[PDB]
Amino acid sequence: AQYEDGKQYTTLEKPVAGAPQVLEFFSFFCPHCYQFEEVLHISDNVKKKLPEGVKMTKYHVNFMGGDLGKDLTQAWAVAMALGVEDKVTVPLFEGVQKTQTIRSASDIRDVFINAGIKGEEYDAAWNSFVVKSLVAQQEKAAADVQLRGVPAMFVNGKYQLNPQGMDTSNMDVFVQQYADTVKYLSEK
């Protein structure tokens, strides 16, 4: 066929019941994730092609960057709770990988302040049990698919995108193939 298991995607031996429809994992420490977000705009191009009624979820992971990696997973929970993902994703990626000015939890916090989230409001969210369960959710989703690498995208808890099996000569063409593959799997 045009789409073949083991070619643009793999099937999970171990399907995950009740999983989010489109589930993406990343790390602010992850160099392809930086490409995916700032250069390729994967999440965005997938969404433009997803059918109606299909919600998109993105989670941070702990297994890169040690202590700071876990802080970032908690910060991403804060970002999700406050609905400010679209204001911190770029400065977090750049603070970690470009300027390397994010070295501590305080430096992460500065990014939110500079993005206009009030200190009071960030610290309250950071310390909230609504953020602790959102951290729990991120960890459980990753654990459910035995996640050992990022970037990663899973559809309907049973298919995993396989970007190595796509051409990267043209960045534009790679992105649409990726997005079209998610749509295909979505409709499966």
Side-chain angles (χ1 to χ4, degrees):
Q2 294 279 347
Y3 296 100
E4 291 175 315
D5 186 318
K7 145 182 193 181
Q8 298 107 321
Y9 68 100
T10 51
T11 307
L12 304 180
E13 293 189 15
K14 253 274 183 303
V16 172
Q21 294 171 286
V22 180
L23 181 49
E24 185 178 337
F25 295 100
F26 80 109
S27 172
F28 287 111
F29 278 96
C30 159
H32 284 120
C33 303
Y34 190 111
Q35 289 298 298
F36 265 47
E37 173 61 20
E38 302 227 320
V39 179
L40 300 180
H41 310 279
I42 291 291
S43 298
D44 208 280
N45 280 275
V46 171
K47 165 175 198 184
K48 302 181 335 198
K49 271 181 172 176
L50 290 181
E52 173 168 354
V54 194
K55 85 179 304 296
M56 216 149 156
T57 310
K58 174 143 66 191
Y59 287 162
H60 198 267
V61 300
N62 289 342
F63 60 79
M64 302 186 76
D67 222 286
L68 249 191
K70 274 201 78 146
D71 277 326
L72 285 167
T73 302
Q74 189 162 350
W76 188 246
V78 175
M80 287 188 293
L82 299 176
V84 298
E85 297 97 321
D86 292 349
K87 297 165 176 201
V88 297
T89 292
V90 164
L92 286 173
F93 264 122
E94 300 197 348
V96 175
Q97 298 185 46
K98 187 185 176 177
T99 58
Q100 290 178 0
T101 46
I102 291 172
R103 315 195 217 248
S104 71
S106 183
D107 301 337
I108 301 170
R109 177 179 188 277
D110 286 346
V111 168
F112 286 70
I113 304 300
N114 187 52
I117 290 81
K118 294 171 193 343
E120 25 189 316
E121 183 184 16
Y122 180 91
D123 298 337
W126 180 271
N127 287 303
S128 71
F129 293 81
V130 165
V131 160
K132 316 208 171 235
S133 66
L134 271 181
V135 169
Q137 288 167 229
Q138 291 180 94
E139 296 184 12
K140 175 179 180 283
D144 281 350
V145 305
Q146 294 181 298
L147 185 74
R148 137 191 64 195
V150 284
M153 187 174 299
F154 297 85
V155 181
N156 282 150
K158 28 186 163 184
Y159 307 113
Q160 185 181 341
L161 274 286
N162 189 29
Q164 286 88 2
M166 309 179 187
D167 196 322
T168 71
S169 66
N170 183 292
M171 314 193 85
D172 299 316
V173 168
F174 167 75
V175 173
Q176 287 329 310
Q177 177 169 17
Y178 195 104
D180 287 347
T181 301
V182 177
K183 185 174 184 286
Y184 161 78
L185 294 170
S186 179
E187 291 160 358
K188 213 169 166 88

